[PDB]
Amino acid sequence: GEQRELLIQRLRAAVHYTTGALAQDVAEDKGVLFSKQTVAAISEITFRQAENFARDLEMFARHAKRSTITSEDVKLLARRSNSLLKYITQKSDELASS
Amino acid sequence: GGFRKETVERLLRLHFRDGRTRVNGDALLLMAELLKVFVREAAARAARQAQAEDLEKVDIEHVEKVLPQLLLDFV
């Protein structure tokens, strides 16, 4: 149980590092400072959304009688935004070409 | 920059409701690009918001004001 909580922390603070990075980049382009609390939030929010990308990806595969998540599963996930789906289908046509 | 493939993987695994559930590789890359987009989006909508309030500092209330719409447009 404790080992889990430790995984939690390493992760949460991980998504925090990357969040803060992406966050700065947007900050430079747009020319505005993000409060620390701002990035904190964006971070937690990202973390939470993960739970639903997760449980929906689980669902999405196990519906194909499968335990292993494919590019197809991400695409299905991403179907609900035409812009978003267009873009991730692009990223997968780049990634598929190897 | 971006998200570490491994951390994505451990993040997805954390929330799975059945032990045996696992993720392929090119998936993990795409879940990475996807996460990046979600974050750059929250950041930019919040910044948009602040900037349109004639503010230099993007503050937490901006993340909240844009948050509900963000969750919608996205998944």
Binding site: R79, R80 | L72, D73
Partner: protein, 73 residues
């Protein structure tokens, strides 16, 4: 009670070679019902936020945008 065949007919019209099964149209029906339920809940609260006692098109449109989004698969 259900215009079930009308259900199968609607979908056939959208997805012709998509064939349904069993009672599945009863669940599709239910999803539709619960869609309406949502659109109602939402639209009512949009009126009560408008200081209005009456459901007006503006309210229904707002709602349709949101609930219709919540409805995607």
């Amino acid at each position: 009670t259900v215009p079930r065949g009308t259900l199968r007919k609607i979908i056939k019209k959208h997805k012709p070679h998509l064939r349904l099964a069993a009672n599945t149209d009863l669940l599709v029906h239910l999803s539709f019902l619960l869609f309406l339920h949502r659109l109602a809940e939402e639209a009512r609260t949009n009126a009560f936020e408008n200081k209005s006692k009456i459901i007006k098109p503006e309210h229904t449109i707002a709602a349709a945008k949101v609930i219709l989004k919540k409805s995607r698969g």
